[PDB]
Ligand binder design. Structure first.
Ligand code: H5O
Length: 139
């Protein structure tokens, strides 16, 4: 697609409430996973990881990695992605959580574990996708 995967979207000044990140693309026909990683260097404040075939099930895993410890996984069985199909992911930053919507439907909320939001300066987009667009705006 017009953007190369993996793709790093800089977040100058980090994330702040009211920030909306929009990502559009298509899932590859033989997809295994998608990853969105809100990063503070080597740490990952918010890892959003649709897994298409984990023990023969679809699941979204969300987590945080701080000092190479992954935390408690937050798992959602609701899974709005499909092999070969277009998607739109929107992540809205609020003061207490990230809110994620896919295809204009609310999917999940993830409470901030890494709380220095102005230091989360990169969003990495990786995995089995074609990416058409990735951008952010303050709403
Ligand atoms: C492979 O390690 C993944 C982590 N990961 C994935 C990637 C990644 C990055 C990229 F750039 C990529 F391109 C890319 F493809 C993947 N980087 N780190 C990350 O997703 C992390 C999130 O917690 O998970 C580990 S695997 C983690 C291992 O520990 C046990 C966990 N396990 C199994 C079950 C469980 C619970 N309920 C029902 N069935 C099974 N529960 N926990 C398991 O999920």
């Amino acid at each position: 697609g017009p953007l190369t995967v993996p793709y790093d979207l800089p977040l100058p000044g980090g994330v702040m409430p009211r920030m909306l990140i929009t990502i559009m693309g298509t899932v590859k026909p033989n997809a295994n996973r998608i990853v969105l990683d809100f990063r503070r260097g080597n740490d990952v404040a918010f890892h959003f990881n649709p897994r298409f075939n984990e023990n023969n099930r679809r699941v979204i895993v969300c987590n945080t990695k701080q000092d190479n410890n992954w935390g408690k996984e937050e798992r959602q069985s609701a899974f709005p992605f499909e092999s070969g199909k277009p998607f739109k992911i929107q992540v809205l930053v609020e003061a207490d959580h990230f809110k994620v919507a896919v295809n204009d439907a609310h999917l999940l909320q993830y409470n901030h574990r890494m709380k220095n939001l102005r230091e989360i300066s990169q969003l990495g987009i990786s995995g089995d996708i074609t990416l058409t667009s990735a951008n952010h705006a303050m709403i």
